[PDB]
Amino acid sequence: AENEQMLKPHLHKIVNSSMELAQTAKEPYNYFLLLRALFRSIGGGSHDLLYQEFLPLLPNLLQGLNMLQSGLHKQHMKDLFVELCLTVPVRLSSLLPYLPMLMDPLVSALNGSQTLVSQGLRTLELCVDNLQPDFLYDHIQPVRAELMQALWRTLRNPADSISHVAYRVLGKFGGSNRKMLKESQKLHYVVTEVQGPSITVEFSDCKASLQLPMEKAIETALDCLKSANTEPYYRRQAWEVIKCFLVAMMSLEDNKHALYQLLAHPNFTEKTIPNVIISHRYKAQDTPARKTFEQALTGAFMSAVIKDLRPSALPFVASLIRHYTMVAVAQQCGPFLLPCYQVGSQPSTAMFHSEENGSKGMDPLVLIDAIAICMAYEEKELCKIGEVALAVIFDVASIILGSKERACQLPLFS
Amino acid sequence: NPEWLISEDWALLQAVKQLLELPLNLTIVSPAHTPNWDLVSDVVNSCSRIYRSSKQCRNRYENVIIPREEPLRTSQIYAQDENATHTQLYTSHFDLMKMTAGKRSPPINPFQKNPKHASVLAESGINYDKPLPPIQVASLRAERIAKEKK
Amino acid sequence: MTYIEKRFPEDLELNAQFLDLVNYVYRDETLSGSELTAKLEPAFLSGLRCAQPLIRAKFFEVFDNSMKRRVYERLLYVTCSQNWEAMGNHFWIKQCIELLLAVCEKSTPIGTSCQGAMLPSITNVINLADSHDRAAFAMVGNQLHMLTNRHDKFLDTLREVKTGALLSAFVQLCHISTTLAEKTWVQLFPRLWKILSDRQQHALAGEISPFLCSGSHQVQRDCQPSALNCFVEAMSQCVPPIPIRPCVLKYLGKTHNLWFRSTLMLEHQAFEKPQQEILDSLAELYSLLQEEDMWAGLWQKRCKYSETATAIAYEQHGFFEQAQESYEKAMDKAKKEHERSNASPAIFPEYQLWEDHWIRCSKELNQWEALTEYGQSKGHINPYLVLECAWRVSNWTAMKEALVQVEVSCPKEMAWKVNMYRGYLAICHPEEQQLSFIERLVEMASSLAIREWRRLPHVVSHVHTPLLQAAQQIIELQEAAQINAGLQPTNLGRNNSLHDMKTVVKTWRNRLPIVSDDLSHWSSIFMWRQHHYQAIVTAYENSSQHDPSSNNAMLGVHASASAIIQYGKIARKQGLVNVALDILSRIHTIPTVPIVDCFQKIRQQVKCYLQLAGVMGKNECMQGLEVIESTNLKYFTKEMTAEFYALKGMFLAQINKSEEANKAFSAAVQMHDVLVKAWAMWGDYLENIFVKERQLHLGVSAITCYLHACRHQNESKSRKYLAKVLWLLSFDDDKNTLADAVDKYCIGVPPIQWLAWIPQLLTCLVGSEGKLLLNLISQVGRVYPQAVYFPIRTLYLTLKIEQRERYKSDPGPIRATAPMWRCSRIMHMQRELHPTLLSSLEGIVDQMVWFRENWHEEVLRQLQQGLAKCYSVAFEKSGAVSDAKITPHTLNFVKKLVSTFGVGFSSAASESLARRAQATAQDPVFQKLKGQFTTDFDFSVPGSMKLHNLISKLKKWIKILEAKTKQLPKFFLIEEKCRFLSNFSAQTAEVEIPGEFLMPKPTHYYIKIARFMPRVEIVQKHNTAARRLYIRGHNGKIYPYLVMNDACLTESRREERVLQLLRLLNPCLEKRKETTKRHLFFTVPRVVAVSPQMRLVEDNPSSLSLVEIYKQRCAKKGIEHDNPISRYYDRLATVQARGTQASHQVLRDILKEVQSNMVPRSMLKEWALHTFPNATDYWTFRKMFTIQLALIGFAEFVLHLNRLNPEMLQIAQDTGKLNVAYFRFDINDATGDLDANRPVPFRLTPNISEFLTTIGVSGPLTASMIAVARCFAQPNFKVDGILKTVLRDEIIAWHKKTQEDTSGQPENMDSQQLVSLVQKAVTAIMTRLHNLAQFEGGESKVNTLVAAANSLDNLCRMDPAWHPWL
């Protein structure tokens, strides 16, 4: 009764300030928490005083929240956006001309966490109970495939109440819950026929052997190493899987004297380096082997960040980066030149491993793709290991070539 | 519940026999091949008569079969005793009832241009005998809209 | 073991202690105690599956040593000696993985057999190249020595890793993840099967089936990834797994989530051909899947008695009364045959089919009393049917006895049905009114329904429709709970309960099922609502004091009347008139009813008489007219009289009087000028009489009628009327009477209605009626600037290009034509009105001009089109000579091509692009290529003029170029040259995605282009290197588009017209039953022509073509895709070498050999099997393929479109949708009429039929074809008008093209020739549609059409370039 008079004059002010400042802020999280608290306070009870001043704020606020939740953001940020944009303290009577801007976040809330799917089903029941079926159907017509697919997926939710309310709203929809979906449901399919990487296993009891594919195994390892909910020993097992996959997918046919005689040649430090340009614009689609290699490499780089896995992951990662960069400089420099790196050559698919001829052996340039996808990872702590990888690459390149400025002409750096 | 037909009874016996187990004790060596009563239930209720295959009946009628299998054997009563006359008579009775139901089902130029339908229109103020062309009707609609606007 | 884990699951300490205790009991003192281990099996299993790794390890170490370390022994153990019942809803197959991977050898170096993906060592460069280079290299500071030493030490550390470290961690990883571990078993078990010898494999396969059953191993029935699912998937994924029983397959499919996998396996067994059990189980499983078409096809293949086929055909297309009559005739004939002699027991399934389908038909025909009398037969009481049909006739005692008889023997799948029946009983029983357990029953029913839902496939389909329908009746029972709670005398009359009752009644009135649902569900809903409506009515008859206004009883009366009327309307829509008359006789038996709903009842009656007046008889139609005239109009309103007179005029125009009908139409329109339907029908009649008598004073009237009908209504409805309006413009005279007529009464019609017909009115823009149509298009454009700017832009540029060729003699600029100035003044006005939006559109169009890529793919596409035309012309010379000479036109084409070879508004982008082209044209590579080509492509030498010599040289150059063009960029950044596109933002202009204004949408949520994605990929599609552009919107989604360079301004404009036609026909498919029921719809991508040479088309990334899949399979096999055509032509030449012109047998054997040698019919089938490993995904893809193929075949046959070449059919892998590459009407260039009379009506080559497994054809394909034929055949849609409107401009362009060769006066074709030709053309399509729609006697010509589409006697005569084998 008394405090609503001092908050009303500043409502528009704080709303607009938080909306325009979080866009160019350093940690735009506390502002959205403040907005959520303000919405909760305005919705709590029937104030009927701040409602009049909040009504003219929906035209821009709803659009901004929709643009925010539609863009790519971290999981917690997206959850906060979708939950604060759905729980607006405004009655449906006035949200009619601004209702269309609530289906895009609704379909995401239905696909979100348990709290998010519950809030989405709550809003869906609220709008289907407080509005005529015809207008609501004409309203959801633009986005019906996603909404119905999410309502059908959440029906299998372990939570009994969630599935029950989902079934209740589906029955409330009536015949519209099964209308033809022009945007037909998507289904998984394979794009290539070549087999992915596998590990050889033998059986001495029957004098035979098998091949164990490990694409989905590496995928599971990376997935459980990325998430934070996994336990430490499972992370260690996944790191072990990735390490054995990495070490099993290389030749390991190098000698000490032979390596010394190969790297100790005057041409490596005297001959001009071919200035060919590497560009993924000519690179074909990623083969199963290459994507599995990238996944294993990024999983190793992540384990190098994991605290309990760092002591054994960081040295192995450094040594593997050394191996990759050394084989690269050996195949692309020295007296032995590949038919695609000689003088006068041009960019081509021979530099990358592809389903076509491509290169003769596995492309060592995949290490750069791993560092790229790691630095572009959602978590920024991974950028440290990427910088360490680049540092060791440059250092060992200058060591093997000397005259640091000369080691930068390698197409590897391009 | 309706009586069990010898056809579906032999079907049940065979389904149990096709479970690779003996009736002497229904857990034979390779104990993982426990009796799948739901499987034989599904295989039996696909016979002539109604489902009649709840959790109870499946066990009850097999326990009834065991004594008379350890008189004529079920396989003998199937191959013998008018092999296909029982189910065929059942189906003939069903079809006769069908025809009786379908038969007893029910089967399911006075020009009068009365003056009421024309008198209501005359009261409305429009002539029916003289068809007003659509152009004049459109002009009248435009004039009415103009009058309304003023 | 029993209680410690049940009551203390969270306290892992005591659980671990008990597990250590049992592990010690099992480990130590084994020689003393071995009987105690029998009862503690559940404890051991639980400790093995515990979440703690140490306990799991110490349990597995003792579980493994108890068995021999042999793969076969462990497999036999886990398959027949181990009982997993004690596990409990666990994915025990991971323990099988543990056991199978632990026995592997783990004392050897690690390695891999993937030699193709091997990574080269550091010293691998010492042996790759020649010898002496490395021999001389081998005979040639500390900072490098230390690095080498450390690297060698590290490599030595890696070489110590053994295989045992990999498998243990692999198993520990599979432990935590149920997904991607099921896959490991699926992918590893067949690998084990491969190494097992025949002796082991035989016994294992013989004992697996007992293990597939394994009795009490059913707790997994509710497990999402049930173990039996994975096990049977793995078993089926083996090579030799022949022995598996079909009964067990069906049982696993039903109980476990193995529906589609089980169906695929059963049909794979069935199509390999004592053996009828396979087909019986397959038909049962199909009937369980609600897939009516596959079941019908399978039975038609199995049908012995001819009557069964006709009955199934009738019931499949909604002919329920004729289906019931045919079933009755069939079972009567069977009874007669039985009286003659006994039949084989294999006929019993047909008898059960007849029984259950007659029951279903009688259920659909509103025979509830007959069904009750039948199920209640003394000798064979059918308690389920009685329980189903008892509550709908208020037989509550029979319903209660049937329920108590079913509750003890109800299928667990019908648990929610039993709960709903128990609720109905408790709510509606007279002497058992106990409203204490209501919400509990609803909760239990919902839980059971959700549990059953969890047992269905993950991809929603017809299998899930029953539960989606049950949800509505369940929530209605929940609402009925409070309804009855409020109707009791304690709450009777209370306002709080009255408001709730009113709200619930309004919601019920506004909540309706869809027409796609069978009438059975509509009845189950409406009759259930009727009980409570009557209760409300009756409840307000003994409480005259409560609410003394005679309103709440009237509320229930009105609700019941409206529900009855809606049920009758739905029954009528589905094609039932007898049940409609029955319902009308029913509603007539009421003391009194409202006057508002009686008018609607009379309206439905006259609508029934209307739709029944197709072949109306004199007696029946006159009796209907008398019944109509007998209705009283005293206490009624005025608008109702208008509608009544309109319907009277309609019904009387149906008969050949035409005078009283005109009078009634005029009187109705005068009664209520706002009535849209009356004026629309009046305009229809006026158009008819105008086309017949040809009186000028009637065309203006018809156009005014159509316009006034289109004024105040929605665009979806008014579309077919604007279609009629646009066609009438071809009858105007020199005075342009109807032109001024339409120009005088156009003020008032919404402008959005013309968006779907902009192209139709643009063609008239160039006629003598220009100025008024220009004003009209400009007026409608003032609201939609882009929708009118893009088409006028394209047409203006095409006119300028055409004039450039018309004035070849005059150099420099030239004067503009009349249509040019006309359509450019409007563009000037638009720029004056919408400057920012049009400027942004111009910027976009000028930036996308940079997509003129290069000469490489340009000349590639040129020579591809050349080869295509060469083959098309050689097929004509095939049978005659086949040693033919190149035609003059093809010679000129190839000459111009090899001469230009790629290099052939006051803007500056075009100038910069030309400068860049001239710059890049200074390299020696392309010059040498041009020289080498010109030194070969010359025709002035003898022996080179032969057509096949040219074809061979073209193929050689095609191979050379495709080997050359394989080194080019695959994507480029948009910011490289397209600055305005990269800098584009929502703040610049509110421009919408192209192709949005084409079809108006009810809502205004049009996704605006937020920004253009930086990457622009290059994809090889349509035999050209198209540029794929990605555009992002404010919603976060991305839309891909192909900036296609047409290079032919006529063919593209004629191609994108059938797309508009199909888009216009798409709504109609969604307004009828048997079409929505089958999900029939045209997949029409969006195509907008931005210039004569360039057009922007929508697409999706994963969309292959038939030729793409064929050439992919060939490259996999390592052969050339041009081999079969060359072989056909070689056989043709070698046969004609002895003067014998190739006969029919020659073509037949050529087809047979090319199919058996290099093109097996099982190519597409194996491709689909490999592409979609999941059974559900494969089944969904195949069903979508079948339905879309049927739809497009019906389209290409009924609509005289060009032959569906294999490269045209696009096949979307992500959804299975089938869209073709821009069909076009094959109008004869000589005669100007449609002559789509090829030997094959539609593409059903052997490969397709093999992919459709020969039953998808006989079922869903022909079923969908018949449905879509009967759908468009309905007169209410007036598809003939749309066809006429499109063919008008399709023939105007033909005339323009035919008259351009000779040489405003010639701007108009004729006043009588164009109309006559259009009428001749449209009838050719209408007759072909009616021939397919005919469904007399349960038989249709579609069967003979599909049979001829795959007959070898006709396929061999098709063009080799058409690929009758692919």
Ligand SMILES: O=P(O)(O)O[C@H]1[C@@H](OP(=O)(O)O)[C@@H](OP(=O)(O)O)[C@@H](OP(=O)(O)O)[C@@H](OP(=O)(O)O)[C@H]1OP(=O)(O)O
């Ligand atoms: O729904 P009904 O009352 O039975 O009649 C409808 C109605 O037209 P009317 O209500 O004016 O008769 C439809 O349109 P809506 O009113 O539902 O939007 C539609 O007619 P349109 O074709 O004009 O959309 C349809 O017709 P169809 O069967 O062609 O879809 C059908 O009319 P019928 O009486 O022919 O069923």
